[PDB]
Design a protein around this ligand. Structure first.
Ligand SMILES: CCn1nnc(O)c1C[C@H](N)C(=O)O
Ligand SMILES: CCn1nnc(O)c1C[C@H](N)C(=O)O
Ligand SMILES: [Cl-]
Ligand SMILES: [Cl-]
Ligand SMILES: [Cl-]
Ligand SMILES: [Li+]
Ligand SMILES: [Li+]
Ligand SMILES: [Li+]
Lengths: 263, 264
């Protein structure tokens, strides 16, 4: 049929999508800026579609409820037909690949540790062998699932602690995790993906640090409902944008050119 | 060949695929060892297929010949129906994605610079601003195409130099490029992917090193002919092996540092 506006699900997560300064008097896509706003414009230009950015209603990346088997977050929006594409820092995982389609990755990353500067932790093993410093992950996504599924002793030990810790060590948004690190006087460390950790390290008051090696190696993909005809063109666009240097330019723009912690 | 046997095309490139010691008295898949040999076994077990390892006849990764329009290398063996899958350090690129299918990546890497130790080069920008030290890439693959297509000033300047350099700076195999670095007394530098550069730096004769940051960020994928029924299961197997930690285990095994250079 005739062209329809493509509904893009995404998540309010700096620097991927952020409210523009004057958003209160703006409408539609003009309300937003960021890495994924720019990426959406490039993908749409290369693929020849018009689109509307829509923030995921529940604020989540996406996980499947073990009891009901219902998917939430951006994954759920695609699975249940509420959006046509997700353009967000959404990790390619096996359980998600089984239910939605993904482009080849537009960014490479791994789980990492965020500390308040001066915290005496250098590794996941360090966290797992002490109890003074609490630690947790984001809810409803790939990082929490990594710990729940790991057979590696250090990560099983960490999961066994986190799942039963009181008060809860899990957070609903990345921003809540950052605040918990910043306000906890060294007594909370946050487990999150490396490029988000790197972003926060460039933001005032410049009081957090990424420590240790990444725990894994994976990627973000542009996601579509399984079998959607949009997937092929979107994937070719991702590969072209990578090869032309545009994805590197966008990371540099939003992470480093705009950094607040010096040169 | 035998029914139900998946023909795997791969390439001799250490430590991905190597001839075992005394391979002359071995047969079939047992002749070979390395990261991609182990990966092929893991993929085949997860997907439930028997397979035959074959070394690509022309020794190339794969590009589309500018004149004849014919794909060569492992890509060509898939395109023309000679192999059923490629399991190799084969880079996922746009031009290849248009003609073959790829899994999600099993390894992440980028183009990098190999110098003979002591060469006064620290970056791609350094190479681009001088002419005493020649530099080049492998023929018939993703690294050459990267420079040919790039509009980034430094990389465009490097391409303009490399494409007309005499004698030619392009090499037929990674081994030829490394040998040329070693024998050129600092006057040749080689552009090759990072994981290989790192493997070579930690081994005798301990005379090369990786310098500068990676020039790009990309991945190796398992390739199948476009539309092949094998692709879906192979992709899920790559993701499962990554999530189980097995790809990291394989990397750590085949890049294990026994201390050939320094302390280990
Ligand atoms: C900024 C994204 N992010 N940073 N840390 C975590 O855990 C996430 C979410 C993850 N990419 C997902 O798809 O669940
Ligand atoms: C070990 C592989 N490699 N190291 N440097 C280059 O250029 C290559 C080949 C490349 N992965 C291709 O698919 O063409
Ligand atoms: Cl460089
Ligand atoms: Cl430029
Ligand atoms: Cl290991
Ligand atoms: Li999928
Ligand atoms: Li066969
Ligand atoms: Li393809």
């Amino acid at each position: 049929g005739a062209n329809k506006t493509v509904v893009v699900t995404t998540i309010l997560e700096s620097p991927y999508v952020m409210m523009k300064k004057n958003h209160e008097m703006l409408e539609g896509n003009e309300r937003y800026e960021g890495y994924c706003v720019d990426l959406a414009a490039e993908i749409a230009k290369h693929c020849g579609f018009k689109y509307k950015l829509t923030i995921v209603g529940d604020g989540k990346y996406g996980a499947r409820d073990a009891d009901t088997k219902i998917w939430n977050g951006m994954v759920g929006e695609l699975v249940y037909g509420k959006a046509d594409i997700a353009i967000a820092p959404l990790t390619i995982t096996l359980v998600r690949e089984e239910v939605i389609d993904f482009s080849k990755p537009f960014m490479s990353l791994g789980i990492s540790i965020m500390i308040k500067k001066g915290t005496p932790i250098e590794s996941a093993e360090d966290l797992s062998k002490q109890t003074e410093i609490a630690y947790g992950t984001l809810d409803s996504g790939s990082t929490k699932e990594f710990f729940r599924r790991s057979k590696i002793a250090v990560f099983d030990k960490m999961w066994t602690y986190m799942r039963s810790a009181e008060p809860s060590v899990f957070v609903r948004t990345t921003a809540e995790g950052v605040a918990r690190v910043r306000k906890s006087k060294g007594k909370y460390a946050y487990l999150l993906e490396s490029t988000m950790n790197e972003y926060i390290e460039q933001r005032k008051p410049c009081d957090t640090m990424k420590v240790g090696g990444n725990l894994d190696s994976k990627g973000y993909g542009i996601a579509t409902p399984k079998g959607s005809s949009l997937g092929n063109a979107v994937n070719l666009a991702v590969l072209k944008l990578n090869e032309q240097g545009l994805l590197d330019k966008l990371k540099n723009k939003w992470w480093y050119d705009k950094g607040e912690c010096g040169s």
